[PDB]
Amino acid sequence: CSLDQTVAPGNLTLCGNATLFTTFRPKARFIAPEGWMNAPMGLYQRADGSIHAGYQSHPKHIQWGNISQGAAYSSDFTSWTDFNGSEGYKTIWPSQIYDIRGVFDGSIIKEGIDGYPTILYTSTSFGPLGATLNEAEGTETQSLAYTTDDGASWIKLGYGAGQNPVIYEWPETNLTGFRDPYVFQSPRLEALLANTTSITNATGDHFATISGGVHGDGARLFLYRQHTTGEFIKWTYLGPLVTTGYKESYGEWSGNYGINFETAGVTRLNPAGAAWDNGSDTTAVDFVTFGTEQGRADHQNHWPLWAAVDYEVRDNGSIEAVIAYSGVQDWGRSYAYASFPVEGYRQVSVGWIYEDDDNVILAKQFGYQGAFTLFRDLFVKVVENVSPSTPGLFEQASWSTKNSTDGMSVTVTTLGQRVVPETLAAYKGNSTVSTLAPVMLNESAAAYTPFSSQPTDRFYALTGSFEFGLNTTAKAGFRVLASEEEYTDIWFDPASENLTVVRTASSLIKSFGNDTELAKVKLYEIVGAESKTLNLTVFVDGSVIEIYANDEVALSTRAYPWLANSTGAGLLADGTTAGDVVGVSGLELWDGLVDAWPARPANTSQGLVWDGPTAAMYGLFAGY
Amino acid sequence: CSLDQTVAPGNLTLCGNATLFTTFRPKARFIAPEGWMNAPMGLYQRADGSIHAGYQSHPKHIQWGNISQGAAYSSDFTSWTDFNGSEGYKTIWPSQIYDIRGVFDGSIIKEGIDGYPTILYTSTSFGPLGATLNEAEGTETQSLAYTTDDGASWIKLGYGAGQNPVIYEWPETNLTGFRDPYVFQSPRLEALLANTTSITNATGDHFATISGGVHGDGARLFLYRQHTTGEFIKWTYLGPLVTTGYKESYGEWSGNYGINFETAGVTRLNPAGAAWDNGSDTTAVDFVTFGTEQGRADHQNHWPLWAAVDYEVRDNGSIEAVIAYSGVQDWGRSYAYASFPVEGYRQVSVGWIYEDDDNVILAKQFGYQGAFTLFRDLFVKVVENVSPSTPGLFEQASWSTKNSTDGMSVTVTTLGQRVVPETLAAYKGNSTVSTLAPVMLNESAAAYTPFSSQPTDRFYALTGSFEFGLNTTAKAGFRVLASEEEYTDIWFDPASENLTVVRTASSLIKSFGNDTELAKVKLYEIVGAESKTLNLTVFVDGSVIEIYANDEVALSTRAYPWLANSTGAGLLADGTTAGDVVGVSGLELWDGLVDAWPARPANTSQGLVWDGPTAAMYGLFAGY
Ligand SMILES: *[C@@H]1O[C@H](CO)[C@@H](O[C@@H]2O[C@H](CO)[C@@H](O[C@@H]3O[C@H](CO)[C@@H](O)[C@H](O)[C@@H]3O)[C@H](O)[C@H]2NC(C)=O)[C@H](O)[C@H]1NC(C)=O
Ligand SMILES: *[C@@H]1O[C@H](CO)[C@@H](O[C@@H]2O[C@H](CO)[C@@H](O[C@@H]3O[C@H](CO)[C@@H](O)[C@H](O)[C@@H]3O)[C@H](O)[C@H]2NC(C)=O)[C@H](O)[C@H]1NC(C)=O
Ligand SMILES: O=C(O[C@@H]1Cc2c(O)cc(O)cc2O[C@@H]1c1cc(O)c(O)c(O)c1)c1cc(O)c(O)c(O)c1
Ligand SMILES: O=C(O[C@@H]1Cc2c(O)cc(O)cc2O[C@@H]1c1cc(O)c(O)c(O)c1)c1cc(O)c(O)c(O)c1
Ligand SMILES: O=C(O[C@@H]1Cc2c(O)cc(O)cc2O[C@@H]1c1cc(O)c(O)c(O)c1)c1cc(O)c(O)c(O)c1
Ligand SMILES: O=C(O[C@@H]1Cc2c(O)cc(O)cc2O[C@@H]1c1cc(O)c(O)c(O)c1)c1cc(O)c(O)c(O)c1
Ligand SMILES: O=C(O[C@@H]1Cc2c(O)cc(O)cc2O[C@@H]1c1cc(O)c(O)c(O)c1)c1cc(O)c(O)c(O)c1
Ligand SMILES: O=C(O[C@@H]1Cc2c(O)cc(O)cc2O[C@@H]1c1cc(O)c(O)c(O)c1)c1cc(O)c(O)c(O)c1
Ligand SMILES: O=C(O[C@@H]1Cc2c(O)cc(O)cc2O[C@@H]1c1cc(O)c(O)c(O)c1)c1cc(O)c(O)c(O)c1
Ligand SMILES: O=C(O[C@@H]1Cc2c(O)cc(O)cc2O[C@@H]1c1cc(O)c(O)c(O)c1)c1cc(O)c(O)c(O)c1
Ligand SMILES: O=C(O[C@@H]1Cc2c(O)cc(O)cc2O[C@@H]1c1cc(O)c(O)c(O)c1)c1cc(O)c(O)c(O)c1
Ligand SMILES: O=C(O[C@@H]1Cc2c(O)cc(O)cc2O[C@@H]1c1cc(O)c(O)c(O)c1)c1cc(O)c(O)c(O)c1
Ligand SMILES: O=C(O[C@@H]1Cc2c(O)cc(O)cc2O[C@@H]1c1cc(O)c(O)c(O)c1)c1cc(O)c(O)c(O)c1
Ligand SMILES: O=C(O[C@@H]1Cc2c(O)cc(O)cc2O[C@@H]1c1cc(O)c(O)c(O)c1)c1cc(O)c(O)c(O)c1
Ligand SMILES: O=C(O[C@@H]1Cc2c(O)cc(O)cc2O[C@@H]1c1cc(O)c(O)c(O)c1)c1cc(O)c(O)c(O)c1
Ligand SMILES: O=C(O[C@@H]1Cc2c(O)cc(O)cc2O[C@@H]1c1cc(O)c(O)c(O)c1)c1cc(O)c(O)c(O)c1
Ligand SMILES: *[C@@H]1O[C@H](CO)[C@@H](O)[C@H](O)[C@H]1NC(C)=O
Ligand SMILES: *[C@@H]1O[C@H](CO)[C@@H](O)[C@H](O)[C@H]1NC(C)=O
Ligand SMILES: *[C@@H]1O[C@H](CO)[C@@H](O)[C@H](O)[C@H]1NC(C)=O
Ligand SMILES: *[C@@H]1O[C@H](CO)[C@@H](O)[C@H](O)[C@H]1NC(C)=O
Ligand SMILES: *[C@@H]1O[C@H](CO)[C@@H](O)[C@H](O)[C@H]1NC(C)=O
Ligand SMILES: OC[C@H]1O[C@](O)(CO)[C@@H](O)[C@@H]1O
Ligand SMILES: OC[C@H]1O[C@](O)(CO)[C@@H](O)[C@@H]1O
């Protein structure tokens, strides 16, 4: 096998295991040392202020199985250190009858068993497991473990009556799934339920949701409440928090609710970040974030969504979360977002970016699959002085509108997402920064214009503000990972309101996905303005392209160009004329980013293994 | 609940857990500290000469499940010490996908992985498991672990290709079972196969049998050979060693071969003990020992059997063991016999004695279930100068006959079993011994005659030689655990050739089994003798009654009298007259025996637990 990246790629399926380990690999983000990873899990801020991040992990394999928690820590979300114990970087693994099929997603009770951080996780055992299969009760249960050494190891409660698993009864029949327990405190929900606690007897200070659905009848998020403060065995089922319809869609701005929820969480935000009021803060908004399955024809049939909700108290002492508006957390190849509280009134969200090799053609040659997104602060985005003539404004699809008293302006509210400032500062400070001259894209603009400074490798960030006429039909954006023969084009088209990533030329290697990514972006036009602005930030990190628009729209995707010189970048322009002009300013190239894993060598492969003929016999894991 | 043993028993099902722990409990034999035990496993003589004994174990439960190896050691088979590690007295437990359903029976490779003692055991996973169910491949596999600290702990090989499990392919389709690997060296089999090794390429110095059968078509013992000396991953299937018919019986002296084998082993014996010749010792005989299932209407549908076999070499380089004669290892409530080699050319066999509470009425009140038999030396029993007029002699049912040259006498050969001399010496030396005067049982003999010295508790041994007329119709034997109201009668009836244990009066507690035990005993009449002798030894140990006749016939059973004074013993006589007389001599009472577990307190209960509602959900174990 040839690794000559100055000529066309050969038959790369002849290459050995992990021979392509460093070729496309992200360097500036959270990723496992090697092998398979998927969903973030067990996220919490430790007593010293550092961040503990777990992830679904299958070392020395490139497909899912024996799923375990791998873990690492960081003081700044950006530079990480692996745990290293008897199971390497793993800290929780299948070990008991109740979890032998996989230690699935879980979340952290900060002050749990004997006061220690405690994880509530989905413990899986034998039987069909999946939204499209006939799953039975017991296959997915919920279990506890706690740590006395701040995440280096976890001790599970014993198996049995009054111990693990702690939640095992299905709250309704014919579930499509029953997993991903999300533990949270909520002054809001406590205040709302305070007059109903004699009906249910549940008076604890922790709530937990479990994600699932009902066969034939749509997804469900089930709400539980800790029965008694300071005690963690008994969790009382209150009722369904979120109920959606079988493949129901709230519209073009909102994905599709599919048939089953995964990795759902509940938070409360205000314009500054996390909100811990009981309802009294009128600027605060209740949100649910959730993945949906089987409501999408591509992207592994998965939508990572969010909804702003209004809580109502039911007669039986439960809560209905009524969806007020509903959006998309990321429009690309990402899923399984988790959020967790951080000091200084923050709620931080992170997801998993899958590869674009769905037929598993070069997975073994990679020697790993998957990475995280960047860590994102959540907040309520507020846009004042919005013009009522903004096209489609009053659909209020993934946003809310509040008219001024005179009816001449609107205040828009939606979910804000922005990369955590610790990462932006570290990235910028460690990079070679080029501040580029502003550019008018007019009749003289080429289709592609390389920046006056170019990246030196596949690790960089771009930023720019694109100013468009209110009635423009021009398109503009950024080309990245570009040589003459390979390139990835990121376009915004204000007339259609579509942000696209065109990947028909992203790689000479034909086995990788090449479908066009698409996100909807609403440019809220400002009263008195004669133009509208798209602020676009793009992170290029090995094969990851992660795009942020206006601290609101995120789109993560993959590009795998073969050629060593497919690293360039510049401006894209289409239909720009003397009359239809696009002004581009605030242009910066951050070349290099940071090495997110300073203790790791470049090649952290430990080889790949096969589980042997018993993998097919047990029928649980692919085995490689 | 009342524990007053001077009055009739109340409703003992009202008693708490382990309140009857010491009431019926053996003291002088191998038994777990508490909870459920079954089959012996992992038996081997350690480097210091001590004996390591494992057993199938489920602590803090009184039914089978999560089956593990519990273990202890002894320098004399008699006084034992528990291992004590992180899992108490357990040393191997379910921990991996391949063995999570249970660590079933296994046997020892004395010089295995890196030269260490190594166990090959049945690792079980999910799915229907049983001879009467539709079991599938993978549910039962065979796996390796080794010990670097002579049995205090075991390290399993890793899961995967070229590692555990090491044997997983079914050698034939539609197996009724696939377990209990028995590893052994055999100069005999090596000599027989030496001209066929180019056909199979299997040239290792270890063989292994796996016990099972084929649905609808009877039991099978499958023979494997280690592929290469010094290497323990590859075991080559040669062919079926023993093939028997669906519920076939060799006759009244031989039990029934049922539908499936369990815990089968292979040995070679001569008149002094174990034989390690290649075929050249003409006094040596090849034997197979094996349990059978579903060929019996009672005794949990289980026969512990043995067969003398003649090996034949097949064209494909495998061995057929042709049954020459076939017997019963124990006629009572015992099963799962294992044998292992011991220094000084010995082969030692031990089994499991189950309780007689098959409806589980007082199991929780006991707080334990099960014990071992005594440890038994195996050898070829030889009886010279046998009269050809011995009734039924030439059926050669569970014995062989060789005529003298003149046809006037016969040499009888069969499987001998006798309690290991270390135990007999320790028992006798620690007991208060009463040597009793010989007794003629004639017209004046009462039905029951108490011995002139009586036991002081439920821990004693009796011995006696009963001399019968050749044409007697009299019956005689021993009554044990006897007061006026409760007693257990052990009768021999030479005319019918039946040894019986009548248990209609064994206990006032009606929930225990009361069926009559029966064994066949052949009294080989000696040329010129005018009488025939039954040598009977009986061990009474809590609730265990273990009977040995003529170093040949064993019968283990249970009696649970309530009354504190139901400990007496004496002679039984029926149909003895002036003309039909039974002479009883060599009479001894050994009162007390030994405390087999000197470091254990009397009550080693640690309470019982329930597995909770998930036990029924997983459907693998009863859960208590
Ligand atoms: C490279 O990694 C693989 C693990 O992915 C190492 O093990 C090999 O794994 C492949 C599957 O990826 C196994 O192939 C399978 O073989 C069976 C038949 O033998 C076939 O039925 C399946 O469809 C599949 O082809 C392969 O047997 C297995 N090889 C082993 C265990 O030796 C492989 O060893 C790694 N290579 C190196 C040099 O480290
Ligand atoms: C005495 O030992 C038992 C374990 O055998 C301890 O746990 C209890 O176990 C029994 C089963 O033996 C459980 O009963 C079951 O309850 C469910 C319904 O609640 C019923 O569906 C079943 O048919 C069966 O009756 C019992 O719940 C369980 N009790 C527990 C966990 O508290 C028992 O605790 C031990 N007692 C003492 C004082 O230690
Ligand atoms: O979310 C939890 O606290 C909230 C977030 C948070 C944080 O990030 C760091 C910190 O210094 C304090 C802190 O107080 C938050 C909080 C504030 C309140 O006013 C309140 O009533 C509440 O229940 C909560 C939480 C979760 C837990 O699982 C837990 O056991 C606990 O004690 C607390
Ligand atoms: O039908 C599947 O299992 C069977 C039905 C079933 C159930 O209804 C409840 C339960 O407690 C266990 C359970 O095991 C069954 C099973 C059947 C088989 O034939 C088999 O090979 C197997 O591994 C197991 C199946 C299908 C699947 O597609 C799948 O991914 C899976 O894990 C399992
Ligand atoms: O906190 C911001 O607004 C406040 C909260 C808020 C809301 O939750 C919903 C809503 O209908 C209106 C609204 O007005 C608030 C506000 C308060 C002020 O004192 C102020 O000067 C202002 O412009 C506004 C904010 C944050 C921003 O990041 C921002 O860009 C902005 O224009 C405003
Ligand atoms: O279940 C069907 O699609 C799923 C539901 C769905 C939706 O509600 C809106 C939407 O924008 C896309 C969409 O894709 C879903 C889907 C799921 C899959 O697993 C899949 O393989 C696929 O092609 C697609 C379906 C039903 C049909 O009746 C049909 O004819 C068809 O081709 C497909
Ligand atoms: O302008 C509104 O029309 C539609 C939405 C829309 C958009 O999202 C983006 C865009 O580039 C153009 C656009 O034109 C749409 C439209 C709808 C019509 O019925 C129509 O005749 C037309 O010319 C054009 C509008 C405004 C609103 O505020 C609103 O609530 C609504 O339902 C609709
Ligand atoms: O885009 C503008 O600057 C460019 C981008 C940029 C930045 O992101 C951060 C920063 O520290 C400095 C900075 O200098 C850039 C720049 C580069 C040149 O070579 C140049 O000639 C120039 O006028 C400028 C801009 C915007 C403005 O709003 C403005 O009024 C102006 O004069 C210029
Ligand atoms: O020897 C270096 O790492 C070791 C090899 C290695 C691997 O093969 C696969 C893998 O999954 C992880 C991995 O970590 C190893 C390692 C071991 C240590 O003791 C250590 O302190 C460390 O940072 C790491 C090294 C070399 C380097 O060149 C380097 O810059 C560095 O930080 C470290
Ligand atoms: O049965 C095994 O040896 C036999 C019994 C035995 C013993 O009890 C103690 C002892 O001092 C030696 C000993 O030699 C036995 C033996 C004798 C031979 O002449 C022979 O050819 C043979 O293979 C064997 C055995 C099993 C094993 O599993 C093993 O790895 C091994 O090395 C040996
Ligand atoms: O039918 C039994 O299992 C089902 C059939 C089956 C198989 O054919 C192969 C296999 O790989 C797994 C497997 O799981 C199946 C299963 C079905 C169920 O409905 C169920 O509740 C369960 O625990 C499991 C069964 C019956 C039994 O009587 C039994 O003791 C047992 O453990 C299992
Ligand atoms: O070793 C015993 O016999 C030897 C072995 C043996 C056999 O295997 C089968 C057989 O057909 C006959 C047979 O004759 C052997 C024998 C050898 C002698 O030197 C001898 O004096 C004798 O009586 C006999 C033995 C052991 C005994 O325990 C015993 O009671 C007894 O009478 C004899
Ligand atoms: O399978 C039947 O018995 C089993 C085989 C068998 C034998 O071969 C000889 C013998 O001495 C006893 C004997 O007991 C077996 C048996 C197994 C059981 O599981 C059981 O519950 C039982 O009563 C007994 C059976 C068949 C029949 O055709 C029948 O009518 C019946 O009542 C029973
Ligand atoms: O004596 C033999 O008869 C039968 C077997 C036998 C036994 O086991 C114990 C017993 O108390 C008595 C007994 O009488 C049986 C017997 C069979 C008959 O056909 C018969 O006419 C008779 O009177 C009585 C005999 C001897 C043998 O040596 C032999 O091989 C055989 O098949 C049979
Ligand atoms: O049964 C016979 O002894 C009795 C049992 C027995 C034993 O088992 C071992 C031992 O060390 C001594 C021993 O003394 C027993 C005995 C007890 C008496 O009270 C007594 O009067 C007597 O003659 C005897 C016997 C057998 C004989 O073969 C014999 O010739 C004889 O005189 C006597
Ligand atoms: O305290 C005694 O044992 C402990 C209690 C106990 C139990 O409750 C349940 C059980 O499964 C085992 C068990 O073993 C315990 C024990 C602990 C030790 O440290 C020790 O050395 C020992 O021999 C044993 C004791 C008392 C006694 O009276 C006695 O004679 C004795 O040997 C030991
Ligand atoms: C990039 O590499 C290719 C092949 O090595 C070459 O054709 C091309 O001219 C190079 N430089 C570019 C596109 O700037
Ligand atoms: C470089 O990145 C590291 C790791 O996140 C960070 O701690 C450091 O401050 C950065 N350097 C700068 C901003 O100069
Ligand atoms: C044994 O105990 C019972 C009841 O306590 C009593 O009736 C009997 O006489 C006692 N002694 C015997 C049988 O020797
Ligand atoms: C060898 O022959 C026997 C008897 O035909 C057969 O049962 C066995 O399976 C054969 N061995 C093989 C196929 O390895
Ligand atoms: C008593 O039994 C112990 C334990 O087996 C044994 O070592 C000792 O020799 C026995 N005492 C005798 C025979 O006097
Ligand atoms: O790895 C299993 C985990 O991944 C998810 O399926 C999301 O893709 C979660 O619902 C689950 O806990
Ligand atoms: O506990 C399981 C073990 O017990 C047996 O069934 C014998 O009764 C063995 O065949 C098996 O290994």
Numbering used by the authors:
A (entry chain A), B (entry chain A): 42 to 665
From the paper:
Xanthophyllomyces dendrorhous β-fructofuranosidase (Xd-INV, EC 3.2.1.26) is a highly glycosylated dimeric enzyme that belongs to CAZy family GH32 and hydrolyzes sucrose and various fructooligosaccharides (FOS) and fructans releasing fructose. It also catalyzes the synthesis of short-chain FOS, in which the fructosyl moiety is transferred to the sucrose skeleton. Then, crystals from the inactivated pXd-INV-D80A enzyme were used for soaking experiments into β-D-fructose and the different polyphenols tested, to get the corresponding ternary intermediate complexes. All the polyphenolic compounds are bound by stacking their aromatic rings against Trp105, with additional hydrogen bonds from their OH groups to several residues at the active site directly or through several well-ordered water molecules that are linked to the protein.
